[PDB]
Structure formats: structure tokens, C-alpha cells
């Protein structure tokens, strides 16, 4: 109800650099209304952290810059396909409290096998393109 913005993350060489990703990789810091607002970031685990999500790709949104007070915001994660359309969208039904270095997301965001399927067309040119949509309320 205060500020709604988005960020697109393109991860090049998803399968080619799967060994070079490691446990977790984080995107560049992003923020809209830069002079007014605060820095965000996107974290993704190519392989899940635990046995429950070992066959899934986990995606999280984390607050980087120290805010003046508690931050509450909703988020919506989706995967852009070959034609640039949103697919497998997953959004938090309610908002969640954010502090510096705190993250929120989905452990089972997408099945890792469904992602690698050539039929789904999710990885063109070996590139996973993610789309985040934050709605900060204050």
C-alpha cells in the first residue's frame, strides 16, 4: 500500500555452471525509489538445503540494508519463459516482517526436474529468468 516494485533476475549458464553455483547464490542488490527506499536482494539454492526440498529449487527474498524500523512486505515469485511470460507463480498470501539480514521465501518453489524439462521452455540459452514483485506496506 506504500510502494510496489519489481526486479528481474537472469541467471546465465544454469545447468552449465551448476557446479559453480554451490549451495546458495545471491543476486545483485536491487531497490526502487533508491533515494527514499532501502536495498533488497534475492537468494536461490539450486539444490534444496534439506531432504524435504532436495529435489526442489528454493528461492528467498532478503533485506540487505538496515532499515529505520521493521519492514513488512508481500512478495510474488515467478519464472519468465522463452516468450517472457510469467509461469509457476508463487506469492505469499500475507505480508511478513523483515529486518536486516532476514529472508523469506519458498523452500519448495519449483521442482528441479520440472525446471530442466525441455518441454516447459523455462531455460532458454541455458538461462533461468526469475521475476520478483515486492509490495512494501508501512
Amino acid at each position: 500500500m506504500v510502494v510496489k516494485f519489481s526486479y528481474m533476475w537472469t541467471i546465465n549458464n544454469f545447468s552449465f555452471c551448476r557446479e559453480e553455483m554451490g549451495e546458495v547464490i545471491k543476486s545483485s542488490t536491487f531497490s526502487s525509489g533508491a533515494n527514499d527506499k532501502l536495498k533488497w536482494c534475492l537468494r536461490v539454492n539450486p539444490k534444496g538445503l534439506d531432504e524435504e526440498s532436495k529435489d526442489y529449487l528454493s528461492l528467498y527474498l532478503l533485506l540487505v540494508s538496515c532499515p529505520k524500523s521493521e519492514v513488512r512486505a508481500k512478495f510474488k515469485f515467478s519464472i519468465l519463459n522463452a516468450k517472457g511470460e510469467e509461469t509457476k507463480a508463487m506469492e505469499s498470501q500475507r505480508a511478513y516482517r523483515f529486518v536486516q539480514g532476514k529472508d523469506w521465501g519458498f523452500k519448495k518453489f519449483i521442482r528441479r526436474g520440472f525446471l530442466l524439462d525441455e518441454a516447459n521452455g523455462l531455460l532458454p540459452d541455458d538461462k533461468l529468468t526469475l521475476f520478483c514483485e515486492v509490495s512494501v506496506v508501512q
Binding site: 537468494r43 539454492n45 538445503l49 528454493s58 528467498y60 507463480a89 508463487m90 506469492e91 505469499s92 498470501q93 511478513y96 532476514k102 529472508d103 523469506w104 521465501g105 519458498f106 523452500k107 519448495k108 518453489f109
Partner: peptide, 9 residues
Amino acid sequence: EGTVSSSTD
């Protein structure tokens, strides 16, 4: 949509 979690748990 889907269950939400954190990576601090």
C-alpha cells in the same frame, strides 16, 4: 500460493 518459509529455521 504454496507454503512460505525462511532459511533461518
